[PDB]
Amino acid sequence: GPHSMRYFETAVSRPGLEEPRYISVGYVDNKEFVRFDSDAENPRYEPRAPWMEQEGPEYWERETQKAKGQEQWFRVSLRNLLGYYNQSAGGSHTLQQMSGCDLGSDWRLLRGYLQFAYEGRDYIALNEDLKTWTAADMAAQITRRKWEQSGAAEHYKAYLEGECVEWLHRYLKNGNATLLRTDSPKAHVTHHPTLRCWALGFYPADITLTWMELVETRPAGDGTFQKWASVVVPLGKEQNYTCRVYHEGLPEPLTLRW
Amino acid sequence: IQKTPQIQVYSRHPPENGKPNILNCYVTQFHPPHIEIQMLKNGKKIPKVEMSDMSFSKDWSFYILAHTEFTPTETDTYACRVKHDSMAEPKTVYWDRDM
Amino acid sequence: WLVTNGSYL
Numbered sequence: 001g002p003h004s005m006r007y008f009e010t011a012v013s014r015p016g017l018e019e020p021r022y023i024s025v026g027y028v029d030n031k032e033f034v035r036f037d038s039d040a041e042n043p044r045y046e047p048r049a050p051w052m053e054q055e056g057p058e059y060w061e062r063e064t065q066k067a068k069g070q071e072q073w074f075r076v077s078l079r080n081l082l083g084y085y086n087q088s089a090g091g092s093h094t095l096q097q098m099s100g101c102d103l104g105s106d107w108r109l110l111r112g113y114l115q116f117a118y119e120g121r122d123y124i125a126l127n128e129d130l131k132t133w134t135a136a137d138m139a140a141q142i143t144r145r146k147w148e149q150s151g152a153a154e155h156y157k158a159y160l161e162g163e164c165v166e167w168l169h170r171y172l173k174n175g176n177a178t179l180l181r182t183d184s185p186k187a188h189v190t191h192h193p194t195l196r197c198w199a200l201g202f203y204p205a206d207i208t209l210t211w212m213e214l215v216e217t218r219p220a221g222d223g224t225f226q227k228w229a230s231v232v233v234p235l236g237k238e239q240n241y242t243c244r245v246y247h248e249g250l251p252e253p254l255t256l257r258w
Numbered sequence: 259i260q261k262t263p264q265i266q267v268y269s270r271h272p273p274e275n276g277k278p279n280i281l282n283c284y285v286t287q288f289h290p291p292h293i294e295i296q297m298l299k300n301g302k303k304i305p306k307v308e309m310s311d312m313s314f315s316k317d318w319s320f321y322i323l324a325h326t327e328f329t330p331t332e333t334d335t336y337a338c339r340v341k342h343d344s345m346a347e348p349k350t351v352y353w354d355r356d357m
Numbered sequence: 358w359l360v361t362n363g364s365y366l
Protein backbone atom coordinates (compact mmCIF):
# COMPACT_ATOMS: atom_id res chain seq x y z
CA GLY A 1 0.00 0.00 0.00
CA PRO A 2 0.96 3.69 0.26
CA HIS A 3 2.88 5.59 2.90
CA SER A 4 3.24 9.22 3.84
CA MET A 5 5.17 11.81 5.76
CA ARG A 6 3.81 15.25 6.68
CA TYR A 7 4.94 18.24 8.72
CA PHE A 8 2.26 20.58 10.16
CA GLU A 9 3.71 23.98 11.06
CA THR A 10 1.89 26.77 12.90
CA ALA A 11 2.97 30.30 13.68
CA VAL A 12 0.92 32.79 15.71
CA SER A 13 2.04 36.40 16.05
CA ARG A 14 1.98 37.86 19.55
CA PRO A 15 1.18 41.60 19.74
CA GLY A 16 3.97 43.75 21.14
CA LEU A 17 6.39 40.84 20.78
CA GLU A 18 9.06 40.10 18.18
CA GLU A 19 8.84 36.29 18.24
CA PRO A 20 5.62 34.51 17.26
CA ARG A 21 4.78 31.18 18.76
CA TYR A 22 6.01 28.47 16.34
CA ILE A 23 4.94 24.81 16.57
CA SER A 24 6.15 22.11 14.18
CA VAL A 25 4.81 18.52 14.17
CA GLY A 26 5.95 15.49 12.18
CA TYR A 27 3.72 12.64 11.02
CA VAL A 28 4.54 9.29 9.43
CA ASP A 29 1.41 7.52 8.15
CA ASN A 30 -0.68 10.03 10.10
CA LYS A 31 1.08 9.06 13.35
CA GLU A 32 3.00 11.80 15.19
CA PHE A 33 6.72 11.00 15.45
CA VAL A 34 8.35 14.39 16.28
CA ARG A 35 7.40 17.79 17.69
CA PHE A 36 8.93 21.21 18.32
CA ASP A 37 7.34 24.03 20.33
CA SER A 38 8.86 27.50 20.85
CA ASP A 39 6.98 27.74 24.19
CA ALA A 40 9.50 25.63 26.17
CA GLU A 41 12.21 27.21 28.31
CA ASN A 42 14.91 25.49 26.21
CA PRO A 43 13.02 24.47 23.03
CA ARG A 44 14.35 21.38 21.27
CA TYR A 45 13.00 19.05 18.65
CA GLU A 46 11.71 15.92 20.35
CA PRO A 47 10.75 12.33 19.43
CA ARG A 48 7.07 11.48 19.91
CA ALA A 49 7.42 7.86 18.89
CA PRO A 50 9.41 4.98 20.41
CA TRP A 51 11.33 4.22 17.19
CA MET A 52 12.61 7.80 16.95
CA GLU A 53 14.99 7.35 19.90
CA GLN A 54 17.17 5.36 17.46
CA GLU A 55 18.44 8.69 16.04
CA GLY A 56 21.57 10.34 17.42
CA PRO A 57 22.52 13.79 18.70
CA GLU A 58 23.39 15.42 15.38
CA TYR A 59 19.83 14.67 14.24
CA TRP A 60 18.13 16.48 17.10
CA GLU A 61 20.60 19.38 17.12
CA ARG A 62 20.10 19.86 13.37
CA GLU A 63 16.29 19.62 13.44
CA THR A 64 16.30 22.03 16.38
CA GLN A 65 18.37 24.63 14.51
CA LYS A 66 16.19 24.16 11.42
CA ALA A 67 13.10 24.85 13.54
CA LYS A 68 14.54 28.06 14.91
CA GLY A 69 15.24 29.10 11.32
CA GLN A 70 11.63 28.32 10.41
CA GLU A 71 10.39 30.33 13.39
CA GLN A 72 12.30 33.26 11.88
CA TRP A 73 10.91 32.53 8.39
CA PHE A 74 7.32 32.66 9.65
CA ARG A 75 8.06 35.83 11.61
CA VAL A 76 9.14 37.55 8.34
CA SER A 77 6.26 36.17 6.29
CA LEU A 78 3.77 37.29 8.93
CA ARG A 79 5.13 40.83 8.77
CA ASN A 80 4.70 40.73 4.98
CA LEU A 81 1.10 39.49 5.12
CA LEU A 82 0.20 42.45 7.36
CA GLY A 83 1.13 44.66 4.41
CA TYR A 84 -0.57 42.62 1.66
CA TYR A 85 -3.85 42.61 3.61
CA ASN A 86 -3.45 46.05 5.26
CA GLN A 87 -3.74 44.67 8.77
CA SER A 88 -2.36 45.92 12.08
CA ALA A 89 0.32 44.20 14.11
CA GLY A 90 -1.86 44.93 17.15
CA GLY A 91 -3.85 41.80 16.29
CA SER A 92 -2.83 38.16 16.52
CA HIS A 93 -2.51 36.37 13.18
CA THR A 94 -2.08 32.73 12.19
CA LEU A 95 -0.04 31.12 9.44
CA GLN A 96 0.01 27.38 8.81
CA GLN A 97 1.90 25.01 6.54
CA MET A 98 1.54 21.40 5.45
CA SER A 99 4.41 19.71 3.64
CA GLY A 100 5.51 16.21 2.78
CA CYS A 101 5.10 13.30 0.43
CA ASP A 102 3.10 10.18 -0.37
CA LEU A 103 4.84 7.06 -1.66
CA GLY A 104 2.82 4.84 -3.96
CA SER A 105 2.56 1.06 -3.97
CA ASP A 106 6.00 0.88 -5.65
CA TRP A 107 7.54 3.15 -2.94
CA ARG A 108 8.30 5.72 -5.63
CA LEU A 109 7.21 9.26 -4.94
CA LEU A 110 3.48 9.38 -5.62
CA ARG A 111 2.58 12.95 -4.70
CA GLY A 112 4.37 15.90 -3.14
CA TYR A 113 2.54 18.47 -1.00
CA LEU A 114 3.40 22.00 0.01
CA GLN A 115 0.67 24.40 1.05
CA PHE A 116 0.00 27.40 3.25
CA ALA A 117 -3.00 28.88 5.00
CA TYR A 118 -3.51 32.33 6.47
CA GLU A 119 -6.13 32.92 9.18
CA GLY A 120 -7.08 29.28 8.69
CA ARG A 121 -7.92 29.59 4.99
CA ASP A 122 -6.04 28.32 1.94
CA TYR A 123 -3.52 30.88 0.70
CA ILE A 124 -1.09 29.31 -1.79
CA ALA A 125 -0.24 25.74 -2.70
CA LEU A 126 2.37 24.06 -4.87
CA ASN A 127 0.79 22.04 -7.64
CA GLU A 128 1.09 18.32 -8.43
CA ASP A 129 3.70 19.16 -11.11
CA LEU A 130 5.93 20.65 -8.34
CA LYS A 131 6.44 23.53 -10.81
CA THR A 132 3.43 25.86 -10.56
CA TRP A 133 1.52 27.57 -7.78
CA THR A 134 -2.20 27.97 -7.12
CA ALA A 135 -3.06 31.22 -5.35
CA ALA A 136 -6.29 31.54 -3.37
CA ASP A 137 -7.01 35.25 -3.75
CA MET A 138 -5.57 38.58 -4.90
CA ALA A 139 -3.12 38.79 -1.98
CA ALA A 140 -1.76 35.32 -2.63
CA GLN A 141 -1.24 36.37 -6.24
CA ILE A 142 1.42 38.76 -4.92
CA THR A 143 3.26 35.87 -3.30
CA ARG A 144 2.80 33.72 -6.42
CA ARG A 145 4.41 36.41 -8.60
CA LYS A 146 7.24 36.71 -6.09
CA TRP A 147 7.84 32.94 -6.03
CA GLU A 148 7.74 32.68 -9.80
CA GLN A 149 10.40 35.39 -10.01
CA SER A 150 12.52 33.63 -7.37
CA GLY A 151 12.01 30.06 -8.63
CA ALA A 152 11.12 28.83 -5.11
CA ALA A 153 9.20 25.90 -6.61
CA GLU A 154 12.51 24.32 -7.60
CA HIS A 155 13.80 24.38 -4.00
CA TYR A 156 10.65 22.61 -2.81
CA LYS A 157 10.47 20.06 -5.63
CA ALA A 158 14.07 19.15 -4.78
CA TYR A 159 13.14 18.54 -1.13
CA LEU A 160 10.01 16.56 -2.04
CA GLU A 161 11.77 14.20 -4.45
CA GLY A 162 14.81 14.45 -2.14
CA GLU A 163 15.07 14.18 1.63
CA CYS A 164 11.29 13.61 1.98
CA VAL A 165 11.33 10.19 0.27
CA GLU A 166 14.71 9.17 1.73
CA TRP A 167 13.85 9.99 5.32
CA LEU A 168 10.41 8.45 4.91
CA HIS A 169 11.98 5.19 3.69
CA ARG A 170 14.18 5.24 6.76
CA TYR A 171 11.37 6.15 9.22
CA LEU A 172 9.43 3.17 7.82
CA LYS A 173 12.39 0.79 8.33
CA ASN A 174 12.90 2.14 11.89
CA GLY A 175 9.24 2.32 12.93
CA ASN A 176 8.17 -0.94 11.23
CA ALA A 177 6.88 -3.05 14.12
CA THR A 178 5.15 -0.26 16.04
CA LEU A 179 3.57 1.25 12.92
CA LEU A 180 2.00 -2.06 11.83
CA ARG A 181 0.16 -2.47 15.15
CA THR A 182 -3.60 -2.91 15.46
CA ASP A 183 -5.52 -3.02 18.74
CA SER A 184 -8.87 -4.70 18.33
CA PRO A 185 -11.88 -2.81 19.72
CA LYS A 186 -13.91 -4.09 22.67
CA ALA A 187 -17.61 -3.56 22.15
CA HIS A 188 -20.85 -3.63 24.12
CA VAL A 189 -24.39 -2.24 24.06
CA THR A 190 -26.42 -0.11 26.47
CA HIS A 191 -30.17 0.56 26.82
CA HIS A 192 -31.71 3.99 27.49
CA PRO A 193 -35.11 5.72 27.39
CA THR A 194 -32.46 4.09 22.78
CA LEU A 195 -29.76 1.39 22.39
CA ARG A 196 -26.06 2.24 21.99
CA CYS A 197 -23.10 0.32 20.56
CA TRP A 198 -19.68 1.10 22.05
CA ALA A 199 -16.33 0.36 20.44
CA LEU A 200 -13.54 1.12 22.91
CA GLY A 201 -9.78 0.73 23.00
CA PHE A 202 -8.99 0.42 19.29
CA TYR A 203 -6.15 1.53 17.04
CA PRO A 204 -5.86 2.85 14.36
CA ALA A 205 -8.84 5.26 14.31
CA ASP A 206 -10.53 3.95 11.12
CA ILE A 207 -13.57 1.90 12.19
CA THR A 208 -17.10 1.04 11.01
CA LEU A 209 -20.06 0.54 13.38
CA THR A 210 -23.36 -0.45 11.78
CA TRP A 211 -26.81 -1.16 13.20
CA MET A 212 -28.73 6.09 13.61
CA GLU A 213 -26.73 8.72 15.54
CA LEU A 214 -22.95 8.54 15.88
CA VAL A 215 -20.08 10.56 17.39
CA GLU A 216 -16.83 11.48 15.70
CA THR A 217 -14.00 9.16 16.65
CA ARG A 218 -12.31 10.38 19.84
CA PRO A 219 -8.96 9.75 21.54
CA ALA A 220 -9.05 8.03 24.90
CA GLY A 221 -5.64 9.52 25.75
CA ASP A 222 -3.95 6.11 26.09
CA GLY A 223 -3.02 5.63 22.43
CA THR A 224 -6.45 4.16 21.52
CA PHE A 225 -9.79 5.51 20.35
CA GLN A 226 -13.49 5.30 21.05
CA LYS A 227 -16.71 5.55 19.09
CA TRP A 228 -20.38 4.73 19.56
CA ALA A 229 -23.50 4.57 17.41
CA SER A 230 -27.07 4.38 18.67
CA VAL A 231 -30.72 4.00 17.71
CA VAL A 232 -34.12 4.63 19.27
CA VAL A 233 -35.76 1.19 19.43
CA PRO A 234 -39.55 0.68 19.69
CA LEU A 235 -39.21 0.51 23.47
CA GLY A 236 -40.91 -2.89 23.70
CA LYS A 237 -39.18 -4.73 20.88
CA GLU A 238 -35.83 -5.93 22.18
CA GLN A 239 -33.06 -7.28 19.98
CA ASN A 240 -34.31 -4.40 17.82
CA TYR A 241 -31.13 -4.56 15.80
CA THR A 242 -27.76 -6.24 15.63
CA CYS A 243 -24.58 -4.18 16.01
CA ARG A 244 -21.67 -5.05 13.72
CA VAL A 245 -18.19 -3.62 14.21
CA TYR A 246 -15.62 -3.86 11.39
CA HIS A 247 -12.07 -2.83 12.25
CA GLU A 248 -8.80 -4.10 10.76
CA GLY A 249 -7.66 -5.30 14.18
CA LEU A 250 -10.49 -7.81 14.61
CA PRO A 251 -9.91 -11.44 13.56
CA GLU A 252 -13.57 -11.25 12.50
CA PRO A 253 -16.14 -8.44 12.73
CA LEU A 254 -18.04 -8.46 16.00
CA THR A 255 -21.79 -8.83 16.45
CA LEU A 256 -23.67 -7.71 19.58
CA ARG A 257 -27.12 -6.95 20.98
CA TRP A 258 -28.65 -5.80 24.29
CA ILE B 259 -12.75 34.46 10.24
CA GLN B 260 -13.21 32.12 13.25
CA LYS B 261 -14.47 28.54 13.68
CA THR B 262 -16.43 27.69 16.84
CA PRO B 263 -15.20 24.71 18.88
CA GLN B 264 -16.90 21.34 18.99
CA ILE B 265 -16.65 19.64 22.39
CA GLN B 266 -16.90 16.05 23.63
CA VAL B 267 -16.60 15.12 27.32
CA TYR B 268 -16.06 11.46 28.22
CA SER B 269 -14.07 9.12 30.45
CA ARG B 270 -11.12 7.12 29.14
CA HIS B 271 -12.37 3.98 30.85
CA PRO B 272 -16.01 3.04 31.36
CA PRO B 273 -17.04 4.81 34.57
CA GLU B 274 -17.46 2.84 37.77
CA ASN B 275 -18.66 4.58 40.92
CA GLY B 276 -15.65 5.11 43.20
CA LYS B 277 -12.97 3.87 40.76
CA PRO B 278 -10.10 6.16 39.66
CA ASN B 279 -10.57 7.22 36.03
CA ILE B 280 -9.65 10.06 33.63
CA LEU B 281 -12.02 12.72 32.28
CA ASN B 282 -11.46 13.92 28.71
CA CYS B 283 -12.54 17.17 27.09
CA TYR B 284 -11.85 16.82 23.37
CA VAL B 285 -12.10 20.11 21.50
CA THR B 286 -11.91 20.31 17.73
CA GLN B 287 -12.68 22.25 14.60
CA PHE B 288 -11.73 25.67 15.97
CA HIS B 289 -9.85 28.75 14.86
CA PRO B 290 -7.83 30.87 15.82
CA PRO B 291 -5.69 28.45 17.87
CA HIS B 292 -5.79 30.36 21.17
CA ILE B 293 -8.32 28.74 23.49
CA GLU B 294 -8.89 28.28 27.22
CA ILE B 295 -10.37 25.09 28.70
CA GLN B 296 -11.52 24.23 32.23
CA MET B 297 -13.03 21.24 34.04
CA LEU B 298 -15.88 21.60 36.55
CA LYS B 299 -17.26 19.38 39.33
CA ASN B 300 -20.67 20.31 40.80
CA GLY B 301 -20.06 23.76 39.29
CA LYS B 302 -16.55 24.03 40.77
CA LYS B 303 -13.33 24.25 38.77
CA ILE B 304 -10.77 21.42 38.93
CA PRO B 305 -7.11 22.49 39.09
CA LYS B 306 -4.15 20.64 37.49
CA VAL B 307 -6.08 19.86 34.25
CA GLU B 308 -3.47 18.84 31.67
CA MET B 309 -3.65 20.06 28.10
CA SER B 310 -2.56 17.73 25.35
CA ASP B 311 -0.22 19.12 22.75
CA MET B 312 -2.15 21.06 20.12
CA SER B 313 -2.44 19.86 16.52
CA PHE B 314 -4.49 20.92 13.50
CA SER B 315 -6.38 18.96 10.86
CA LYS B 316 -6.37 18.61 7.09
CA ASP B 317 -8.94 21.44 6.81
CA TRP B 318 -6.61 23.59 8.99
CA SER B 319 -8.88 23.73 12.07
CA PHE B 320 -7.23 23.23 15.45
CA TYR B 321 -7.89 20.52 18.04
CA ILE B 322 -6.63 19.48 21.45
CA LEU B 323 -7.39 17.12 24.36
CA ALA B 324 -7.69 18.20 27.99
CA HIS B 325 -7.75 15.50 30.63
CA THR B 326 -7.72 15.25 34.40
CA GLU B 327 -8.13 12.34 36.76
CA PHE B 328 -11.56 11.91 38.30
CA THR B 329 -13.56 9.46 40.39
CA PRO B 330 -17.22 9.29 39.29
CA THR B 331 -20.00 8.92 41.87
CA GLU B 332 -23.78 8.48 41.59
CA THR B 333 -24.42 12.14 42.48
CA ASP B 334 -21.62 14.54 41.45
CA THR B 335 -21.93 16.19 38.04
CA TYR B 336 -18.93 16.96 35.82
CA ALA B 337 -18.56 19.40 32.93
CA CYS B 338 -16.13 21.11 30.54
CA ARG B 339 -15.96 24.89 29.98
CA VAL B 340 -14.48 26.41 26.79
CA LYS B 341 -13.60 30.07 26.18
CA HIS B 342 -12.76 31.01 22.58
CA ASP B 343 -12.97 34.17 20.46
CA SER B 344 -15.61 32.68 18.13
CA MET B 345 -18.11 32.75 21.02
CA ALA B 346 -19.56 35.77 22.76
CA GLU B 347 -19.53 33.76 26.01
CA PRO B 348 -17.90 30.47 27.11
CA LYS B 349 -19.63 27.17 26.36
CA THR B 350 -20.14 24.60 29.14
CA VAL B 351 -20.78 20.92 28.35
CA TYR B 352 -22.05 18.50 30.97
CA TRP B 353 -20.38 15.09 31.32
CA ASP B 354 -22.92 12.39 30.46
CA ARG B 355 -21.52 9.08 31.62
CA ASP B 356 -23.16 6.89 28.97
CA MET B 357 -22.35 9.40 26.22
CA TRP C 358 13.24 15.54 8.14
CA LEU C 359 11.78 19.05 8.17
CA VAL C 360 11.70 21.06 4.93
CA THR C 361 13.41 24.45 5.04
CA ASN C 362 11.33 27.19 3.44
CA GLY C 363 12.62 29.31 0.54
CA SER C 364 11.52 32.81 -0.39
CA TYR C 365 9.37 34.49 2.22
CA LEU C 366 5.68 34.94 1.53
